[PDB]
Amino acid sequence: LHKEPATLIKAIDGDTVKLMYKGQPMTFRLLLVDTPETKHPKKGVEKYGPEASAFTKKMVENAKKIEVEFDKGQRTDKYGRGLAYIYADGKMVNEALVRQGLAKVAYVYKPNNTHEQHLRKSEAQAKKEKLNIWS
Ligand SMILES: Cc1cn([C@H]2C[C@H](OP(=O)(O)O)[C@@H](COP(=O)(O)O)O2)c(=O)[nH]c1=O
Ligand SMILES: [Ca+2]
Protein backbone atom coordinates (compact mmCIF):
# COMPACT_ATOMS: atom_id res chain seq x y z
CA LEU A 1 0.00 0.00 0.00
CA HIS A 2 1.26 3.60 -0.51
CA LYS A 3 0.24 6.76 1.35
CA GLU A 4 -0.72 9.88 -0.63
CA PRO A 5 -1.30 13.42 0.62
CA ALA A 6 -4.83 14.82 1.05
CA THR A 7 -6.12 18.09 2.53
CA LEU A 8 -8.91 18.28 5.09
CA ILE A 9 -12.11 19.90 3.89
CA LYS A 10 -14.39 18.91 6.80
CA ALA A 11 -14.78 16.12 9.33
CA ILE A 12 -18.36 14.80 9.12
CA ASP A 13 -18.50 12.21 11.89
CA GLY A 14 -16.24 9.67 13.60
CA ASP A 15 -15.67 7.62 10.44
CA THR A 16 -16.43 9.89 7.50
CA VAL A 17 -14.42 12.94 6.45
CA LYS A 18 -14.36 15.15 3.38
CA LEU A 19 -10.94 15.56 1.84
CA MET A 20 -9.34 17.22 -1.16
CA TYR A 21 -7.55 14.39 -2.96
CA LYS A 22 -5.66 14.83 -6.27
CA GLY A 23 -7.29 18.24 -6.49
CA GLN A 24 -10.81 16.95 -5.96
CA PRO A 25 -13.28 17.07 -3.11
CA MET A 26 -14.32 13.61 -1.97
CA THR A 27 -15.89 11.94 1.02
CA PHE A 28 -13.79 9.20 2.55
CA ARG A 29 -15.14 6.43 4.71
CA LEU A 30 -12.60 4.87 7.09
CA LEU A 31 -11.81 1.22 6.13
CA LEU A 32 -12.42 -1.56 8.67
CA VAL A 33 -14.22 0.37 11.39
CA ASP A 34 -17.56 1.70 12.43
CA THR A 35 -18.01 4.60 14.80
CA PRO A 36 -21.49 5.13 16.28
CA GLU A 37 -24.07 6.91 14.20
CA THR A 38 -24.95 10.51 14.97
CA LYS A 39 -26.93 11.01 11.79
CA HIS A 40 -29.19 8.29 10.42
CA PRO A 41 -32.61 8.39 12.05
CA LYS A 42 -33.02 4.68 11.37
CA LYS A 43 -30.19 4.39 13.90
CA GLY A 44 -30.67 7.54 16.02
CA VAL A 45 -27.70 9.08 17.87
CA GLU A 46 -25.96 6.05 19.33
CA LYS A 47 -23.84 6.14 22.50
CA TYR A 48 -20.31 7.51 21.94
CA GLY A 49 -21.48 8.82 18.53
CA PRO A 50 -20.64 12.36 19.62
CA GLU A 51 -17.36 11.39 21.32
CA ALA A 52 -16.19 9.48 18.26
CA SER A 53 -16.96 12.50 16.05
CA ALA A 54 -15.09 14.83 18.36
CA PHE A 55 -12.06 12.55 18.50
CA THR A 56 -11.78 12.31 14.71
CA LYS A 57 -12.43 16.02 14.26
CA LYS A 58 -9.74 17.02 16.73
CA MET A 59 -7.29 14.55 15.29
CA VAL A 60 -7.66 15.67 11.67
CA GLU A 61 -8.04 19.36 12.39
CA ASN A 62 -4.90 19.60 14.47
CA ALA A 63 -2.68 17.63 12.08
CA LYS A 64 0.20 19.15 10.13
CA LYS A 65 -0.20 16.44 7.44
CA ILE A 66 -3.04 14.14 6.37
CA GLU A 67 -2.43 11.06 4.22
CA VAL A 68 -4.79 8.53 2.66
CA GLU A 69 -3.89 4.92 2.06
CA PHE A 70 -6.10 2.87 -0.27
CA ASP A 71 -6.23 -0.87 0.18
CA LYS A 72 -5.80 -3.47 -2.57
CA GLY A 73 -9.47 -3.96 -3.53
CA GLN A 74 -12.18 -1.42 -4.47
CA ARG A 75 -11.42 2.19 -3.66
CA THR A 76 -14.99 3.43 -3.45
CA ASP A 77 -18.14 2.02 -1.82
CA LYS A 78 -21.59 2.01 -3.47
CA TYR A 79 -22.18 5.61 -2.29
CA GLY A 80 -19.09 6.83 -4.05
CA ARG A 81 -17.09 7.35 -0.81
CA GLY A 82 -13.33 6.65 -1.03
CA LEU A 83 -12.36 3.69 1.21
CA ALA A 84 -9.01 4.27 2.91
CA TYR A 85 -6.88 4.24 6.01
CA ILE A 86 -6.34 7.88 6.95
CA TYR A 87 -3.28 9.14 8.75
CA ALA A 88 -2.86 12.30 10.83
CA ASP A 89 0.81 13.17 11.37
CA GLY A 90 1.61 9.58 10.65
CA LYS A 91 -0.92 8.20 13.11
CA MET A 92 -3.70 6.00 11.69
CA VAL A 93 -7.07 7.56 12.60
CA ASN A 94 -8.74 4.17 12.05
CA GLU A 95 -6.54 2.58 14.76
CA ALA A 96 -6.63 5.53 17.15
CA LEU A 97 -10.47 5.25 17.26
CA VAL A 98 -10.47 1.48 17.87
CA ARG A 99 -7.69 1.76 20.46
CA GLN A 100 -9.83 4.28 22.44
CA GLY A 101 -12.99 2.10 22.34
CA LEU A 102 -14.62 4.70 19.97
CA ALA A 103 -15.23 2.28 17.06
CA LYS A 104 -15.59 -1.45 16.50
CA VAL A 105 -13.75 -3.39 13.79
CA ALA A 106 -16.50 -3.81 11.09
CA TYR A 107 -17.21 -4.20 7.34
CA VAL A 108 -14.33 -6.51 6.69
CA TYR A 109 -14.37 -7.12 2.90
CA LYS A 110 -11.48 -9.02 1.33
CA PRO A 111 -9.23 -8.12 -0.25
CA ASN A 112 -9.62 -4.75 1.56
CA ASN A 113 -8.30 -5.97 4.89
CA THR A 114 -4.60 -5.34 4.92
CA HIS A 115 -4.65 -3.84 8.46
CA GLU A 116 -7.34 -6.07 9.93
CA GLN A 117 -5.12 -7.97 12.42
CA HIS A 118 -3.48 -4.71 13.58
CA LEU A 119 -6.89 -3.10 14.08
CA ARG A 120 -8.07 -6.32 15.76
CA LYS A 121 -5.27 -6.24 18.33
CA SER A 122 -6.03 -2.63 19.19
CA GLU A 123 -9.70 -3.48 19.66
CA ALA A 124 -8.97 -6.36 22.09
CA GLN A 125 -6.82 -4.03 24.22
CA ALA A 126 -9.60 -1.42 24.22
CA LYS A 127 -12.06 -4.19 25.25
CA LYS A 128 -9.72 -5.51 27.96
CA GLU A 129 -9.31 -1.95 29.29
CA LYS A 130 -13.13 -1.55 29.11
CA LEU A 131 -12.95 1.76 27.28
CA ASN A 132 -15.99 3.78 26.19
CA ILE A 133 -17.86 1.45 23.93
CA TRP A 134 -16.57 -1.54 25.87
CA SER A 135 -17.18 0.09 29.21
C1 LIG B 1 -16.47 0.76 5.53
C2 LIG B 1 -17.32 0.30 4.36
C3 LIG B 1 -18.68 0.58 4.32
N1 LIG B 1 -19.38 0.15 3.22
C4 LIG B 1 -20.88 0.15 3.21
C5 LIG B 1 -21.50 -0.93 4.07
C6 LIG B 1 -22.78 -0.18 4.53
O1 LIG B 1 -23.84 -0.05 3.52
P1 LIG B 1 -25.39 0.11 3.94
O2 LIG B 1 -25.70 1.56 3.87
O3 LIG B 1 -26.20 -0.83 3.15
O4 LIG B 1 -25.44 -0.31 5.48
C7 LIG B 1 -22.24 1.21 4.83
C8 LIG B 1 -21.70 1.44 6.22
O5 LIG B 1 -21.40 2.83 6.30
P2 LIG B 1 -21.72 3.82 7.49
O6 LIG B 1 -21.20 3.40 8.80
O7 LIG B 1 -21.19 5.13 7.03
O8 LIG B 1 -23.30 3.79 7.53
O9 LIG B 1 -21.21 1.37 3.88
C9 LIG B 1 -18.83 -0.53 2.18
O10 LIG B 1 -19.55 -0.87 1.22
N2 LIG B 1 -17.53 -0.84 2.27
C10 LIG B 1 -16.74 -0.44 3.33
O11 LIG B 1 -15.57 -0.81 3.23
CA1 LIG C 1 -20.49 4.67 11.12
PDB file of all heavy atoms in Angstrom, residues 36-51 53:
ATOM      1  N   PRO A  36     -20.055   4.951  16.052  1.00  0.00           N
ATOM      2  CA  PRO A  36     -21.495   5.133  16.285  1.00  0.00           C
ATOM      3  C   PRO A  36     -22.020   6.369  15.508  1.00  0.00           C
ATOM      4  O   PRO A  36     -21.449   7.454  15.302  1.00  0.00           O
ATOM      5  CB  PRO A  36     -21.665   5.240  17.805  1.00  0.00           C
ATOM      6  CG  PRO A  36     -20.396   4.609  18.350  1.00  0.00           C
ATOM      7  CD  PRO A  36     -19.323   5.076  17.337  1.00  0.00           C
ATOM      8  N   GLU A  37     -23.206   6.084  15.009  1.00  0.00           N
ATOM      9  CA  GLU A  37     -24.066   6.912  14.195  1.00  0.00           C
ATOM     10  C   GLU A  37     -24.540   8.091  15.035  1.00  0.00           C
ATOM     11  O   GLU A  37     -24.835   7.980  16.222  1.00  0.00           O
ATOM     12  CB  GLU A  37     -25.286   6.148  13.683  1.00  0.00           C
ATOM     13  CG  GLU A  37     -26.160   6.956  12.701  1.00  0.00           C
ATOM     14  CD  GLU A  37     -25.360   7.258  11.442  1.00  0.00           C
ATOM     15  OE1 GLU A  37     -24.880   6.317  10.804  1.00  0.00           O
ATOM     16  OE2 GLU A  37     -25.261   8.488  11.261  1.00  0.00           O
ATOM     17  N   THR A  38     -24.524   9.227  14.390  1.00  0.00           N
ATOM     18  CA  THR A  38     -24.950  10.515  14.969  1.00  0.00           C
ATOM     19  C   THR A  38     -25.964  11.145  14.002  1.00  0.00           C
ATOM     20  O   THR A  38     -26.624  12.133  14.381  1.00  0.00           O
ATOM     21  CB  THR A  38     -23.738  11.432  15.353  1.00  0.00           C
ATOM     22  OG1 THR A  38     -23.227  12.124  14.183  1.00  0.00           O
ATOM     23  CG2 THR A  38     -22.621  10.567  16.000  1.00  0.00           C
ATOM     24  N   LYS A  39     -26.080  10.502  12.836  1.00  0.00           N
ATOM     25  CA  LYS A  39     -26.927  11.010  11.794  1.00  0.00           C
ATOM     26  C   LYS A  39     -28.163  10.231  11.440  1.00  0.00           C
ATOM     27  O   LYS A  39     -29.275  10.785  11.554  1.00  0.00           O
ATOM     28  CB  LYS A  39     -26.134  11.181  10.461  1.00  0.00           C
ATOM     29  CG  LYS A  39     -26.035  12.638   9.955  1.00  0.00           C
ATOM     30  CD  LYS A  39     -25.178  13.418  10.963  1.00  0.00           C
ATOM     31  CE  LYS A  39     -23.628  13.485  10.346  1.00  0.00           C
ATOM     32  NZ  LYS A  39     -23.260  14.997  11.047  1.00  0.00           N
ATOM     33  N   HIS A  40     -28.012   9.041  10.908  1.00  0.00           N
ATOM     34  CA  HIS A  40     -29.191   8.294  10.420  1.00  0.00           C
ATOM     35  C   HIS A  40     -30.240   8.084  11.505  1.00  0.00           C
ATOM     36  O   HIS A  40     -29.991   7.607  12.616  1.00  0.00           O
ATOM     37  CB  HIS A  40     -28.837   7.004   9.668  1.00  0.00           C
ATOM     38  CG  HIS A  40     -30.023   6.474   8.901  1.00  0.00           C
ATOM     39  ND1 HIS A  40     -31.290   6.416   9.418  1.00  0.00           N
ATOM     40  CD2 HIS A  40     -30.094   5.960   7.650  1.00  0.00           C
ATOM     41  CE1 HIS A  40     -32.085   5.889   8.503  1.00  0.00           C
ATOM     42  NE2 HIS A  40     -31.386   5.580   7.433  1.00  0.00           N
ATOM     43  N   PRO A  41     -31.452   8.485  11.140  1.00  0.00           N
ATOM     44  CA  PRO A  41     -32.610   8.385  12.047  1.00  0.00           C
ATOM     45  C   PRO A  41     -32.966   6.939  12.348  1.00  0.00           C
ATOM     46  O   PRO A  41     -33.386   6.592  13.465  1.00  0.00           O
ATOM     47  CB  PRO A  41     -33.686   9.219  11.383  1.00  0.00           C
ATOM     48  CG  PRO A  41     -33.043   9.925  10.220  1.00  0.00           C
ATOM     49  CD  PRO A  41     -31.837   9.073   9.837  1.00  0.00           C
ATOM     50  N   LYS A  42     -32.763   6.108  11.344  1.00  0.00           N
ATOM     51  CA  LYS A  42     -33.023   4.676  11.373  1.00  0.00           C
ATOM     52  C   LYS A  42     -32.085   4.026  12.402  1.00  0.00           C
ATOM     53  O   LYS A  42     -32.259   2.812  12.642  1.00  0.00           O
ATOM     54  CB  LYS A  42     -32.798   3.942  10.062  1.00  0.00           C
ATOM     55  CG  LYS A  42     -33.935   3.042   9.580  1.00  0.00           C
ATOM     56  CD  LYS A  42     -33.499   2.223   8.360  1.00  0.00           C
ATOM     57  CE  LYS A  42     -33.709   2.877   6.999  1.00  0.00           C
ATOM     58  NZ  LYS A  42     -33.971   1.845   5.939  1.00  0.00           N
ATOM     59  N   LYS A  43     -31.141   4.827  12.876  1.00  0.00           N
ATOM     60  CA  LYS A  43     -30.194   4.387  13.903  1.00  0.00           C
ATOM     61  C   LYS A  43     -30.385   5.256  15.148  1.00  0.00           C
ATOM     62  O   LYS A  43     -30.444   4.728  16.275  1.00  0.00           O
ATOM     63  CB  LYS A  43     -28.734   4.365  13.497  1.00  0.00           C
ATOM     64  CG  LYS A  43     -28.390   3.292  12.469  1.00  0.00           C
ATOM     65  CD  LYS A  43     -27.139   2.475  12.814  1.00  0.00           C
ATOM     66  CE  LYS A  43     -26.254   2.212  11.597  1.00  0.00           C
ATOM     67  NZ  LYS A  43     -25.460   0.958  11.648  1.00  0.00           N
ATOM     68  N   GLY A  44     -30.513   6.551  14.915  1.00  0.00           N
ATOM     69  CA  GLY A  44     -30.674   7.543  16.016  1.00  0.00           C
ATOM     70  C   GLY A  44     -29.267   8.109  16.278  1.00  0.00           C
ATOM     71  O   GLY A  44     -28.443   8.096  15.338  1.00  0.00           O
ATOM     72  N   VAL A  45     -29.029   8.571  17.488  1.00  0.00           N
ATOM     73  CA  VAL A  45     -27.698   9.084  17.868  1.00  0.00           C
ATOM     74  C   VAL A  45     -27.123   8.150  18.938  1.00  0.00           C
ATOM     75  O   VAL A  45     -27.298   8.406  20.128  1.00  0.00           O
ATOM     76  CB  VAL A  45     -27.762  10.521  18.375  1.00  0.00           C
ATOM     77  CG1 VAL A  45     -26.405  10.922  18.936  1.00  0.00           C
ATOM     78  CG2 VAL A  45     -28.276  11.442  17.282  1.00  0.00           C
ATOM     79  N   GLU A  46     -26.502   7.102  18.459  1.00  0.00           N
ATOM     80  CA  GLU A  46     -25.956   6.051  19.331  1.00  0.00           C
ATOM     81  C   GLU A  46     -24.944   6.576  20.321  1.00  0.00           C
ATOM     82  O   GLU A  46     -24.370   7.669  20.187  1.00  0.00           O
ATOM     83  CB  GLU A  46     -25.484   4.898  18.477  1.00  0.00           C
ATOM     84  CG  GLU A  46     -26.369   4.482  17.277  1.00  0.00           C
ATOM     85  CD  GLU A  46     -25.617   3.528  16.401  1.00  0.00           C
ATOM     86  OE1 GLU A  46     -24.593   4.032  15.886  1.00  0.00           O
ATOM     87  OE2 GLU A  46     -25.807   2.336  16.236  1.00  0.00           O
ATOM     88  N   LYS A  47     -24.773   5.819  21.393  1.00  0.00           N
ATOM     89  CA  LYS A  47     -23.841   6.139  22.495  1.00  0.00           C
ATOM     90  C   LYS A  47     -22.400   6.185  21.963  1.00  0.00           C
ATOM     91  O   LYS A  47     -22.022   5.305  21.175  1.00  0.00           O
ATOM     92  CB  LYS A  47     -23.954   5.114  23.614  1.00  0.00           C
ATOM     93  CG  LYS A  47     -23.471   5.612  24.967  1.00  0.00           C
ATOM     94  CD  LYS A  47     -23.910   7.056  25.216  1.00  0.00           C
ATOM     95  CE  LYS A  47     -23.631   7.425  26.681  1.00  0.00           C
ATOM     96  NZ  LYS A  47     -23.093   8.817  26.824  1.00  0.00           N
ATOM     97  N   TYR A  48     -21.677   7.223  22.370  1.00  0.00           N
ATOM     98  CA  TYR A  48     -20.306   7.512  21.936  1.00  0.00           C
ATOM     99  C   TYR A  48     -20.233   8.123  20.536  1.00  0.00           C
ATOM    100  O   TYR A  48     -19.138   8.433  20.031  1.00  0.00           O
ATOM    101  CB  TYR A  48     -19.443   6.221  22.015  1.00  0.00           C
ATOM    102  CG  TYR A  48     -19.437   5.774  23.459  1.00  0.00           C
ATOM    103  CD1 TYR A  48     -20.269   4.760  23.893  1.00  0.00           C
ATOM    104  CD2 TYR A  48     -18.651   6.457  24.396  1.00  0.00           C
ATOM    105  CE1 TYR A  48     -20.296   4.381  25.239  1.00  0.00           C
ATOM    106  CE2 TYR A  48     -18.644   6.063  25.746  1.00  0.00           C
ATOM    107  CZ  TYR A  48     -19.482   5.021  26.162  1.00  0.00           C
ATOM    108  OH  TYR A  48     -19.567   4.649  27.471  1.00  0.00           O
ATOM    109  N   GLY A  49     -21.379   8.268  19.885  1.00  0.00           N
ATOM    110  CA  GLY A  49     -21.484   8.816  18.533  1.00  0.00           C
ATOM    111  C   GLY A  49     -20.737  10.135  18.552  1.00  0.00           C
ATOM    112  O   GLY A  49     -19.762  10.302  17.802  1.00  0.00           O
ATOM    113  N   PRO A  50     -21.184  11.007  19.437  1.00  0.00           N
ATOM    114  CA  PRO A  50     -20.642  12.363  19.622  1.00  0.00           C
ATOM    115  C   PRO A  50     -19.180  12.421  20.007  1.00  0.00           C
ATOM    116  O   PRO A  50     -18.475  13.284  19.492  1.00  0.00           O
ATOM    117  CB  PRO A  50     -21.543  13.023  20.656  1.00  0.00           C
ATOM    118  CG  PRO A  50     -22.830  12.249  20.518  1.00  0.00           C
ATOM    119  CD  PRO A  50     -22.349  10.802  20.318  1.00  0.00           C
ATOM    120  N   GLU A  51     -18.738  11.537  20.863  1.00  0.00           N
ATOM    121  CA  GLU A  51     -17.363  11.390  21.317  1.00  0.00           C
ATOM    122  C   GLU A  51     -16.436  10.965  20.178  1.00  0.00           C
ATOM    123  O   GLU A  51     -15.392  11.597  20.024  1.00  0.00           O
ATOM    124  CB  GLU A  51     -17.228  10.324  22.399  1.00  0.00           C
ATOM    125  CG  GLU A  51     -17.754  10.852  23.764  1.00  0.00           C
ATOM    126  CD  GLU A  51     -19.237  10.787  23.891  1.00  0.00           C
ATOM    127  OE1 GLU A  51     -20.016  10.418  23.040  1.00  0.00           O
ATOM    128  OE2 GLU A  51     -19.603  11.181  25.017  1.00  0.00           O
ATOM    129  N   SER A  53     -17.028  11.371  16.991  1.00  0.00           N
ATOM    130  CA  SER A  53     -16.963  12.495  16.049  1.00  0.00           C
ATOM    131  C   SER A  53     -15.952  13.528  16.524  1.00  0.00           C
ATOM    132  O   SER A  53     -15.217  14.082  15.699  1.00  0.00           O
ATOM    133  CB  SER A  53     -18.301  13.219  15.910  1.00  0.00           C
ATOM    134  OG  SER A  53     -19.239  12.430  15.226  1.00  0.00           O
TER     135      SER A  53
END
